[PDB]
Amino acid sequence: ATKAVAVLKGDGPVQGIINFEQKESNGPVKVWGSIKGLTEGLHGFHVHEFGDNTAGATSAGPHFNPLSRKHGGPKDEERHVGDLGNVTADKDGVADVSIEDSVISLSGDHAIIGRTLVVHEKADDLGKGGNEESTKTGNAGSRLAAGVIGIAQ
């Protein structure tokens, strides 16, 4: 199997460790971990194009989009590769993340290795907001914490 990890950090209290596991290179990627310090409810959760934290999460660029599609939810065919949807924080501000995605990969020329995982201020509307921003960013708001996705064992 192949594995990766991202340590999420930002200017505020939001932080966590997200693990990626891919049993087979043709297979789904399991994404799991704990993010704390979040407001209760939904938060946009995306892989952004660049593993560049020189200006914090801002320098990460847009959602990772090698197929040049519009923004969607992870279940949509029309989505960015980076569109992992939302994660949900409980009443104590903890998101016990558990996602399985068949579009992202840890290998190949479209790998998310070396790119940036971002958790956002607000819910990702999954492209259903009826404006141009919805089909670009999902209206998820600011970037609360980010981490470069690294090779793990």
Note whether 46 and 86 are within 8 A (CB): no
Is 110 annotated in some ligand binding site? no
Q: State the Cα–Cα distance between residues 12 and 2, nearest whole angstrom.
A: 31
Q: Per the residue annotation, which of 43, 71, 79, 115 is the catalytic one?
A: 71
Q: Which is nearer to Cu ion, 46 or 115 (CB)?
A: 46
Active site residue 43: no
* H/E run at residue 57: strand 54-57
d(CA 8, CA 136): 23
Binder of its own copies out of 10, 37, 44, 51 (CB under 8 A):
51
| Residues 56, 120: Cα–Cα separation, whole Å | 13
Contact flag: residue 47 with its own copies (CB under 8 A): no
Q: How far is the CB of 24 from Zn ion (least distance, A)?
A: 25
User: Is 7 a binder of its own copies (CB under 8 A)?
Assistant: yes
Q: By C-beta, is 27 or 152 nearer to Cu ion?
A: 152
- Residues in the site for Cu ion, rule: CB under 5 A? 46, 118
